Amino acid sequence: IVEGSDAEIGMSPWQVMLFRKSPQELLCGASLISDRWVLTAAHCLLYPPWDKNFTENDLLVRIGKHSRTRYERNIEKISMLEKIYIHPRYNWRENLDRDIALMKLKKPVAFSDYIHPVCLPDRETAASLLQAGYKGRVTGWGNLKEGQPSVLQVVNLPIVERPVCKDSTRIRITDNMFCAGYKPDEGKRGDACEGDSGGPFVMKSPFNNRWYQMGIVSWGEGCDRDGKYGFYTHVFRLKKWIQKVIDQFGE
């Protein structure tokens, strides 16, 4: 996270760290959507142009963390993965369309003060909240500049008008993505960056005071560059797939 600040303790209790077993390293962010399902970006798990294709046994998730590096015996839970599900129409070859994956844990995680699931938006919440100029929040342990934080970082960023998102890049954007960040004329900064990938873009609903995950950190060109914006997987538009997976493979 570029131009953010340290999270408060328990501020993002759905934040998940995707961790490589060998060598031991942070791979990505992710989010807790129930006691046994975790949401992330497909490109965190599968990206053939970089020879990336993880299997379940290659990875762990770490839930309830604050420190990037310390083992938080008190508060974090480390879980194994039962199965990875990648959207079948994830378009890694072109534009990262449908950049979304689910991971089922080998056993349910107990919720605590530090571990708690985020909501997924319904259609009307998405329609109402995902509008240009409204702000959401991104969290992660990724780079501080295009340089790693000690603890989880947070930044709030405005959703950007689709034509502005489109004109900012030559990548072929789709309706399964949105972009967020300040415009040069707004005189403020901030972005997600490498290592934040797969983590959540959330909004606090004014209708029911609950936090909803609207996006997944997906792609960008550099980090925090003027006239560039971070791109996020549009969670509501991919919710039909999430529901199909969970219905078939078991809540």
């Binding site: 600040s5 408060e8 303790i9 328990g10 501020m11 209790p13 959507i33 605590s112 003060d113 530090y114 708690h116 699931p117 985020v118 909501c119 997924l120 509008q131 240009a132 100029g133 409204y134 702000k135 959401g136 929040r137 947070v154 709030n156 405005p158 909004m203 606090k204 609903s205 004014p206 005071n209 609950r210 936090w211 909803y212």
Partner: peptide, 30 residues
């Protein structure tokens, strides 16, 4: 179900340091 309500914030009637920026964007952002 209980999703999206944080034990250390909403459940204790406590606000985090920047959530009001999100709420205010609903007033001023459009």
């Amino acid at each position: 179900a209980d999703c999206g309500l944080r034990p250390l914030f909403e459940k204790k009637s406590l606000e985090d340091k920047t959530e009001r920026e999100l709420l205010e964007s609903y007033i001023d952002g459009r």
